[PDB]
């Protein structure tokens, strides 16, 4: 209803408004979240705690990034008015780590707070992409960023391969063993360097290098705040999921498995060292989705049947306007989705509290905007100068609002 | 070298300036952002700014003439094209009033790997 | 540049040495390192002679 | 340099055919080796041209050459090439180059070609 | 997390913007250098500029 009289029934245009990306923002205090709830619940269907989509389920697609976890309540109703809530925590979150590109993996195994020594890089790389191959033959063309399966602790073990005094083949493992594919099966032991034959019996070529890197490395594949990456395959829950199973993960965030129209991600236990990889997996998965799903589509000259809805609450962590090299995978991916997926059905809802602090590259595409009361004058004049119509009536009221 | 410009923008207080200030006439429309505004103003000839005013004040179809070629600046109205210009774009509203569709969910990751990737 | 990344060298390695039991040993670590030894490491650094005698390896 | 199986390479022009296995360092007389000023440095490098080549969203810029038959594509067809973009080969009086699905990232390279030519 | 701040200065005009922006409660006794108290107005809220010319004359 509107502010100034309280009988009149205030409408907008809604294939306006949700189809096109928006920007909510504001301060402490002013019930951003309590707009937001309200706004969610008045396009999914929830009035007076009860769901009016009762006999039939609503195509409602909303895709929530919660890292406070304060918004669980806001959907979450008693069972007997069956509107269901896929609630992704950190526990139950499965993302496995073989659909994960390049510069993922790198910062996730190899990054660390030293300078990298010579020739670790690379080995890593060759590893991941042998290991890649050998476990499926199928696949024709296998890169290091192929999404395929691969065990990490088979890799481990190819980079556990440090204490090599055979050759700068010459293996010491029975007698001259050749085939180095066994490396993945088992950590192999070898001989001293007291010894020599008919070739050479010198330490290896990465002999002595690696010592550093495998400690960082297997403390990483037993870490337990980064379970949800099914890191340690040795369990059999971790290696039931493989390339056949990229179904059934994708399935998990659009809510297909229990036919839920909301799909919180509770990003609340995943670190801070890891979550710009997570943004960033999920974004790229929705947007490859979404973009295979409409090619598909013009076959039959149709468009996008499902689209989706991604809001992005407290946004001003992993799409800084200015930072360091953290948040860099899920900055690109946040652009991804919002310079394009207008035409490819994906509607994004930036909701920060300090819109002075968020990147411009993804605030700039936003074509309607919900802002609260704000304290901070140079928040105000960003606002207003973003705001496509402020003609001396939107640039005065910004902080008078209650 | 028989090439000139002629610019499209909703917002030309981004568009770079070493672009927009080589231009010599000009088809103003309604706009409603002060920066826009005054960017406006700005380029613009002394012979027209002041019935620049008029800029937030264009209806529907309407808008403002002012360069060399028009012997002075007037507002014109433009007729309708024909065949008329529609972008394909989907509008999420309607597509959400429908009950849940499955989309079988199995081609579009068949149309991840292209054909083995 | 190259004192910054020797003091960061030589303060991980001392907190490592004196402390085995954590396992993520970072420059931010509150563990206990200590600067006589880190001053001594400069000082061995900046007073090293490597020796290149042909046949064993230069250390 | 120097190959794993010995053979010393006179010409480096023989990278351009294949990748080719070198040797590994030794710090000995009988077979000292000394890492080249260029090693190991692209990396990084490498692995982002590896990931631009096998991108397959890209295609318009026909960079998987290796496996393709995109090398059909002498310097000879620059003359169809050019005239493609202006319509001269249908005789099309409006050259319209729409650019929705080009990735974001690749859009400003592909404006600036066009312009250029 | 269970923190809070109730800066202190002679000098607003000194202290970084960082943190008296985010100040959302003022306690202002006399200013009398036009530096400070022109920062001080062009922070606080709109419904106190008004009344915020007292700060020159409070004693």
């Given at each position: 209803?509107?502010?100034?009289?309280?009988e009149?029934s205030?409408?907008?245009?809604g294939?306006?408004?949700?189809?096109?990306h928006?920007a909510?923002?504001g301060?402490?205090?002013?019930?951003?979240?309590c707009a937001?709830?309200?706004?969610?619940?008045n396009?999914?269907?929830?009035?007076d705690?009860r769901?009016?989509?009762?006999?039939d389920k609503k195509?409602?697609?909303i895709i929530?990034?919660?890292?406070?976890?304060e918004y669980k309540s806001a959907?979450?109703i008693?069972?007997?008015?069956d509107?269901?809530l896929?609630?992704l925590d950190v526990?139950?979150?499965?993302?496995?780590?073989?659909?994960?590109n390049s510069?993922?993996?790198?910062?996730?195994f190899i990054?660390?707070?030293?300078?990298?020594s010579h020739?670790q890089?690379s080995?890593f790389k060759?590893a991941?992409?042998?290991?890649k191959?050998?476990y499926?033959?199928?696949?024709?063309?296998?890169?290091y960023?192929?999404?395929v399966?691969?065990n990490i602790n088979?890799?481990?073990?190819?980079?556990?391969n440090?204490?090599?005094?055979?050759?700068?083949p010459?293996l010491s493992?029975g007698?001259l063993v050749?085939n180095?594919?066994?490396y993945?099966?088992?950590k192999?032991?070898?001989?001293?360097?007291?010894t020599?034959?008919?070739?050479?019996?010198?330490?290896?070529?990465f002999?002595?290098?690696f010592?550093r890197?495998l400690?960082?490395?297997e403390?990483?594949?037993?870490d337990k705040?980064?379970e949800?990456?099914?890191?340690?395959q040795?369990?059999?829950e971790?290696?039931?999921?493989?390339?056949?199973h990229?179904e059934?993960?994708?399935?998990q965030?659009?809510?297909?498995?229990?036919r839920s129209n909301?799909?919180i991600?509770?990003?609340?236990?995943?670190?801070?060292e890891?979550?710009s990889i997570?943004i960033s997996?999920?974004?790229?998965l929705?947007?490859?989705?979404?973009?295979?799903?409409?090619?598909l589509?013009?076959?039959?000259?149709?468009?996008?049947d499902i689209p989706?809805m991604?809001v992005?609450?407290?946004a001003?962590?992993?799409?800084?306007r200015?930072g360091?090299i953290?948040?860099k995978a899920?900055?690109?991916?946040?652009e991804?989705i919002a310079k394009?997926g207008?035409?490819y059905?994906?509607?994004?809802?930036?909701?920060?509290?300090?819109?002075?602090?968020?990147?411009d590259?993804?605030?700039?595409?936003?074509?309607?905007?919900?802002?609260?009361r704000?304290?901070?004058i140079?928040?105000?004049n960003?606002?207003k100068?973003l705001?496509?119509?402020?003609?001396?009536s939107?640039?005065?009221?910004?902080?008078?609002l209650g | 070298y028989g090439l000139?410009?002629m610019?499209?923008s909703?917002?030309?207080s981004?568009?770079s300036?070493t672009i927009?200030?080589?231009?010599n006439n000009?088809i103003?429309?309604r706009?409603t952002n002060?920066?826009?505004?005054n960017?406006?103003k700005?380029?613009?000839?002394?012979?027209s700014r002041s019935?620049?005013e008029?800029?937030?004040?264009?209806?529907?179809g309407?808008?403002?003439v002012?360069g060399?070629s028009?012997?002075?600046?007037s507002i014109?109205?433009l007729e309708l094209?024909?065949?008329?210009?529609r972008s394909?774009s989907?509008?999420?509203?309607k597509?959400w009033?429908?009950s849940?569709?499955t989309?079988?969910f199995?081609?579009?990751?068949?149309?991840?790997?292209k054909?083995?990737g | 540049?190259?004192q910054?990344s020797?003091?960061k060298?030589?303060?991980?390695?001392?907190?490592?040495?004196?402390?085995?039991?954590?396992k993520?040993i970072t420059?931010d670590?509150?563990v206990?390192?200590?600067?006589?030894?880190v001053f001594?490491y400069?000082?061995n650094?900046?007073?090293?002679?490597?020796n290149?005698?042909?046949?064993?390896?230069?250390?």
């Open positions: 209803n509107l502010a100034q009289n309280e009149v205030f409408t907008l245009d294939d306006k408004f949700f189809s096109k928006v909510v923002v301060s402490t205090g002013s019930g951003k979240s937001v709830a309200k706004i969610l619940q396009v999914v269907g929830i009035n705690a769901n009016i989509n009762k006999s195509n409602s697609h929530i990034f919660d890292i406070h976890s959907f979450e008693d069972k007997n008015e509107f269901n896929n609630y526990e139950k979150l499965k993302l496995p780590y073989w659909l994960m510069e993922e993996l790198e910062t996730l990054e660390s707070n030293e300078q990298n020739n890089v080995q060759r991941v992409v042998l290991n191959e050998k499926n033959p199928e696949f024709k063309k296998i890169t960023d192929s999404p399966y691969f088979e890799v481990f073990n190819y980079i556990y440090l204490n090599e005094e055979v050759i700068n010459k493992n007698e050749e180095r594919q066994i993945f099966n088992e192999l032991e070898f001989t001293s360097s007291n020599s034959k008919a070739t050479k019996a010198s330490n290896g070529p002999n002595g290098e010592n890197f400690s960082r490395f403390t990483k594949l037993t705040r980064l949800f990456l099914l890191l340690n040795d369990v059999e971790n290696s039931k999921y493989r390339t056949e990229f059934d993960i994708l399935k965030f659009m809510g297909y498995l229990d909301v799909s991600i509770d990003l609340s236990g995943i670190p801070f890891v979550l997570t997996l999920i974004s790229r929705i947007f490859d989705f979404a973009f295979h799903y409409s090619k589509q013009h076959q039959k000259d149709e468009l996008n989706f991604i992005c609450e407290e001003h962590n992993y799409i800084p200015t360091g953290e948040f899920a900055k690109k991916s946040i991804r394009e207008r035409k059905g994906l509607s994004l809802m930036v909701v920060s509290q300090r819109p002075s602090e968020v990147s590259t993804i605030l700039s595409q936003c074509n309607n905007f919900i802002n609260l704000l304290t901070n140079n928040d105000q960003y606002i100068n705001l496509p119509d402020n003609s001396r939107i640039s005065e009221i910004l902080p008078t | 000139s410009l610019v499209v909703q917002r030309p981004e568009v300036d927009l200030s080589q231009c000009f103003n429309l706009l002060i920066n826009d505004q960017y406006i700005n380029l613009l000839p002394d012979n019935i620049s008029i800029l937030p004040t264009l209806g529907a309407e808008c403002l002012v060399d028009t012997p002075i600046p014109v109205k094209p024909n065949p008329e210009p394909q989907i509008k999420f509203h597509k009033s429908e849940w569709r989309p079988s199995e081609e579009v990751i068949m149309r991840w790997r054909e083995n | 540049h190259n910054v020797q003091f060298r030589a303060v991980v390695l001392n907190k490592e040495k004196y402390n085995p039991e954590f993520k420059y670590s509150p206990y390192f200590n600067i006589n030894e001594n400069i000082y650094l900046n007073e090293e002679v490597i290149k005698i042909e046949g064993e390896p230069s250390l």
